[PDB]
Amino acid sequence: VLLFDEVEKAHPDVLTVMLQMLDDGRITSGQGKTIDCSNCIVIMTSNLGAEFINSQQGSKIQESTKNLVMGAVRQHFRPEFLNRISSIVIFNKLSRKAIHKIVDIRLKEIEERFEQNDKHYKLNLTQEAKDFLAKYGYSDDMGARPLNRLIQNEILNKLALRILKNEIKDKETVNVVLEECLEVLPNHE
Amino acid sequence: EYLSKYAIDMTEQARQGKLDPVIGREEEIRSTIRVLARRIKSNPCLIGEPGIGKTAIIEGVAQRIIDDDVPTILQGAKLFSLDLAALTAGAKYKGDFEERFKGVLKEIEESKTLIVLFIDEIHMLMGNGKDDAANILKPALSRGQLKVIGATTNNEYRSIVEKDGAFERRFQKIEVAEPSVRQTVAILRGLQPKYEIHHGVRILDSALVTAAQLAKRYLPYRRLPDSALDLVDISCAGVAVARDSKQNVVDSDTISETAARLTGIPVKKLSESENEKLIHMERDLSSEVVGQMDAIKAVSNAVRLSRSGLANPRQPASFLFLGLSGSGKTELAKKVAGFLFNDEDMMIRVDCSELSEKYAVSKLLGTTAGYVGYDEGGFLTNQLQYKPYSVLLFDEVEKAHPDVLTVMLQMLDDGRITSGQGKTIDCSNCIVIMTSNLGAEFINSQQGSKIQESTKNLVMGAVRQHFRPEFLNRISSIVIFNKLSRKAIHKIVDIRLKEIEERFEQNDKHYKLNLTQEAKDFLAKYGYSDDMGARPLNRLIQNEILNKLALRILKNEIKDKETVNVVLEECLEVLPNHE
Amino acid sequence: EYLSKYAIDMTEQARQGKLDPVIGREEEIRSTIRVLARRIKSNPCLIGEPGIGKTAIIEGVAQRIIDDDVPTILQGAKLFSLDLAALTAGAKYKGDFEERFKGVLKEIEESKTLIVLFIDEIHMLMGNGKDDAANILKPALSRGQLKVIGATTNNEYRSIVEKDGAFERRFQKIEVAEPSVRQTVAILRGLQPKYEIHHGVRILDSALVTAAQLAKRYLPYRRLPDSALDLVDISCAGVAVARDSKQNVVDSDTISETAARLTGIPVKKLSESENEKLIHMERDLSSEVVGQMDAIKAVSNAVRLSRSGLANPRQPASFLFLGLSGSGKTELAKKVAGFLFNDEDMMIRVDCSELSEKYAVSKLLGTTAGYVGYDEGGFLTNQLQYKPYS
Ligand SMILES: Nc1ncnc2c1ncn2[C@@H]1O[C@H](COP(=O)(O)OP(=O)(O)OP(O)(O)=S)[C@@H](O)[C@H]1O
Ligand SMILES: Nc1ncnc2c1ncn2[C@@H]1O[C@H](COP(=O)(O)OP(=O)(O)OP(O)(O)=S)[C@@H](O)[C@H]1O
Ligand SMILES: Nc1ncnc2c1ncn2[C@@H]1O[C@H](COP(=O)(O)OP(=O)(O)OP(O)(O)=S)[C@@H](O)[C@H]1O
Ligand SMILES: Nc1ncnc2c1ncn2[C@@H]1O[C@H](COP(=O)(O)OP(=O)(O)OP(O)(O)=S)[C@@H](O)[C@H]1O
DSSP states (O other): OEEETTGGGSOHHHHHHHHHHHTTOOOBOTTSOBOOOTTSOEEEOOOTTHHHHTTOOTTTTOTTHHHHHHHHHHHHSOHHHHTTSSOOOOOOOOOHHHHHHHHHHHHHHHHHTOSSTTOOEEEOOHHHHHHHHHHHTOOGGGTTHHHHHHHIIIIIHHHHHHHHTTOOSSOEEEEEOOOEEEOOOSSOO | OGGGTSEEEHHHHHHTTOSOOOOSOHHHHHHHHHHHTOSSOOOEEEEEOTTSSHHHHHHHHHHHHHTTOSOHHHHTOEEEEEOTHHHHTOOOSTTHHHHHHHHHHHHHHSSSSOEEEEESSGGGGSOTTSTTSTTSHHHHHTTTOSOEEEEEEHHHHHHHHTTTSHHHHHOEEEEOOOOOHHHHHHHHHHHHHHHHHHHTOEEOHHHHHHHHHHHHHHOTTSOHHHHHHHHHHHHHHHHHHHHHTOOOEEOHHHHHHHHHHHHOOGGGGOOGGGHHHHHSHHHHHHTTSOSOHHHHHHHHHHHHHHHHTOSOTTOOEEEEEESOTTSSHHHHHHHHHHHHHTOGGGOEEEEGGGOOTTTTHHHHHOOOTTSSOOSOOTTTHHHHTTOTTSEEEEETGGGSOHHHHHHHHHHTTTSOOEETTTEEOOOTTOEEEEEEOTTHHHHTTOSTTTTOTTHHHHHHHHHHTTSOHHHHTTOSEEEEOOOOOHHHHHHHHHHHHHHHHHHOSSTTOOEEESSTTHHHHHHHHTTOBTTTBTHHHHHHIIIIIIHHHHHHHHTTOBOSSEEEEEOOOEEEOOBOTTO | OTHHHHOEEHHHHHHTOOSOOOOSTHHHHHHHHHHHTSSSOOOEEEEESTTSSHHHHHHHHHHHHHTTOSOGGGTTOEEEEOOGGGGTSOOSSTTHHHHHHHHHHHHHHSSSSOEEEEOSOGGGTTTTTSTTOSGGGSGGGTTSSOOEEEEEEHHHHHHHHHHHSSGGGTOEEEEOOOOOHHHHHHHHHHHHHHHHHHHTOEEOHHHHHHHHHHHHHHOTTSOHHHHHHHHHHHHHHHHHHHHHHOOEEOTTHHHHHHHHHHTOOGGGTOOSOTTTTTTTHHHHHHHHSSSOHHHHHHHHHHHHHHGGGOSOTTOOOOOOOOOSTTSOHHHHHHHHHIIIIIOTTOOOOOOGGGOOTTTHHHHHHOOOTTSSOOOTTTTTHHHHTTOTTO
């Protein structure tokens, strides 16, 4: 899989090369060899449509709203490029409904990525922690990014300190007031 | 026999138990077996990055042959490696090595059961215009004779086959995978007794795991089969050294410390008795800079997260510091570098004012192959490959032209910052601080020394109206500095005077001040700028106090312990050649 | 014994002494040893910038080896400095140097205790298109004992491994770096008797300190061991001349005059004539600057701060001269240079009406990588490299 991060920023000369790679596949090397990329999947990304998606006109992007986005992609990129893409997909807004599910996923991935995959959460407050994060992390026009940051800001930062103080082994738990915070394990570890 | 002179009987080394075992790699071994079992052109070649076990795999099949876990074609086999000596022994007497090589190949084909030749570093035979290659193996391999096993690096291969053609025809490349972390541990475990025996140490399973985990995360320039072993082997050596330098059980901490010594990642020192500093780094930073506690706390958490290992393995800490000039934005970054490595010059500074979107991206990451110049990326590439745990500072990012701000996106996300020569940095161990004065517009609304809502949001307004959201969304925390309060100024003056006094290399050059509050209040009254912050305190001191000192030194009116007095216009007293 | 025709037996020299003491490098040495003590990849490298003790480390470990202050594995090991003719003796006939390299490794590999090579300049082997081009002759056997300690700067290192790809998977980089200023002094101190003996002069302990501090605050292009040692050696040579003329390295005067000679920077010379220096300048300037004493004093104040060290080492003094057109402020800047250097034309200047967003930064500091024109430093650093204090 090839990934091109923010193709809208690439100078057009680049895109010009990619035109062959994306269609026909005979990208060649600087030394004169033919590579042939046709067995790859290519994903290119850009944010031009953000300017219209932020209008909140649908979670799933609505007709017209999508055309505003297509307007921008056509204004920015040569059609020679756009025509060669198998498909242009306009992402949906991550609605509050979505954030509820996303919170779950992120909490799980946070545990999964630990090196010390011992220090898991219990969380408690399934509905309250989920809701706290779902509400406070819902900066819709920033997608799910704020959520990740919220969890970091409210849970992990505190956790790290509690760890330095040996206040936690595992099964970490969350309380809420009113402001989401962490508890301690009386048994230092 | 020439094989006894220009080759190594790998089968015999395996027979004698002198080779390390191959752990798994069944798909690769099977692939080489199938190729060796071919009717024609039975010449597999292992292609992959260096350090992934290619040679080991071939030694692996030698072991399968030793124990008859191979096809009958291979059961009768003897495997020899080819020494470079076939050629490197010299070509005086033109054609001498050509004959030596022709000779050994003759002996290999000639009757004596199945002989398999392993040629390590197969690109060795590219040949200067071929000729030295002498294509001696070429027609031989084309007849299905001399089964040859090759092995080389992805790009070495490229330089062979794309400069030859025949190589691609003569060999069947087999990609060798880099093992997963889980597999890596299994490999280490399999090799563990070899190390335990060699070093005279015990290795615990958590050690094996630790090496594989740390290696993937902290040794990005070396593939797991080696990186994990390097951590184990070196840690074990550390035990051996320790014993002889004046118990022998290698564990996770043993390795973590070792890794820190090799990678520079301070997290892995695991010096928990130093948690006092990490826990209280907020007070420590507050002893150098005054107030601005939100910035201190924001940073402190970056550090604590990294120390705890909780920090996202791919997301360098990132900050955007907003506020008045003289607010302490840069000063804090210096003190962070100070705290983390006991060195304010540890910092890698990039001055964004020198940027130009038409040129300057290359100042950080360099240019690509072809364009004039190389030693690329003086600011980032050539620093980050040496000090992954350093603090980067990007001064005045709001002045950066957009293409540079675009570069920052890699840095602030994943850390996989690419380099002009097609290489990657992977700066996930980094802490990155950026500064900006966009907020000057609203922070100088003076709506509380501690900036309040609305005003703060207007600061974010300026940020949002300047930087693309794509950038802002990658900042761990955007921090708006507070305007210094008069009280802060007082404290700053005290600390700043302390720094100045401490700075002297000659212990005559100091003050007692007198006017223990009054001198400081003068400095505040005459240096408390709502739009220059503390910076004028530095200048005020230099002009009204240190120049008077310079005059006093010059005229020998001051010896030491100088004191301050005030006109109406702060001035200094005289402590002449009496002392 | 091919090795004996090409390499220097560092162990034998250490056995006979004839080596400098090694100061503060114990940990680089411990790391070197630890890697050498490894089961397989026992190939450490001393890496940094020139003049940072990379070969000092080797003399150091050679001495630790002589005294059995090394692990079992190294207890009886020997070490040889090779490179050199190993790659050039074979000036004719294909495969000749290649044979030597191989013969040397053979000599090392077989029986004769543990022999460790020291490669002073691994980049010289490089692997010039691989295909038997020297460095490439090694890798086959990098596992087979043949332990070797390498050495290279970071630029050289990066060039090698980027072009090669295998060495960075075979060798263990050890960071070697310049010492702190105090550590530098300890080094200078350690070599102090060497210089004192060869020049027949004494070095004041305070001269060692001055050289260390000075180098840190004087020569940004030279790493502290060499930089401070050169300040010491250069000074010692000057003292030796005084000794011969009819002594010691004077912390204040030998080093300051040496430094003043080598670079300049009025601050590093600091004249003793305090009754007039930094006083008379206001009168001299007053004659040039009639009435506007305010500017003179502003400048004089900064000048006075730089002298005797009140000025902050990282804050070049600087002024903005605002005022009535035709005030004479440009000449003032020159007249100040007059006093500062006894040279009104010492300065570097830029016509700012020539500056534009399209090019100005590069006109001032030079273009960057890949762009036309390598007049590095443009209008400014192009000149600062010659006169840092102008
Ligand atoms: N079972 C195994 N799987 C993978 N690697 C192993 C295994 N056993 C040992 N190793 C070590 O893995 C390292 C990889 O190096 P080698 O395979 O010898 O060299 P390489 O991987 O072929 O890369 P080059 O081309 O020799 S730099 C070796 O140092 C082996 O000691
Ligand atoms: N809160 C503070 N505590 C102590 N010293 C401070 C503080 N704020 C500013 N200073 C002084 O201000 C000087 C550097 O201040 P900064 O505000 O970081 O400079 P700066 O304005 O960041 O420069 P920039 O970032 O390019 S505008 C130092 O010499 C500090 O002594
Ligand atoms: N402890 C020491 N022992 C020997 N030499 C020292 C020592 N400390 C500093 N030096 C100086 O450093 C020189 C050799 O040390 P290095 O700093 O490695 O020089 P170098 O850069 O290794 O030499 P090359 O060949 O250019 S790498 C000596 O000639 C001394 O002048
Ligand atoms: N206050 C002063 N400071 C310095 N020089 C002065 C002053 N008053 C008169 N002069 C004389 O005026 C002449 C110097 O003039 P210039 O410095 O060329 O003019 P200028 O005002 O610097 O032009 P600028 O700076 O580009 S507006 C010399 O001959 C000085 O002696």
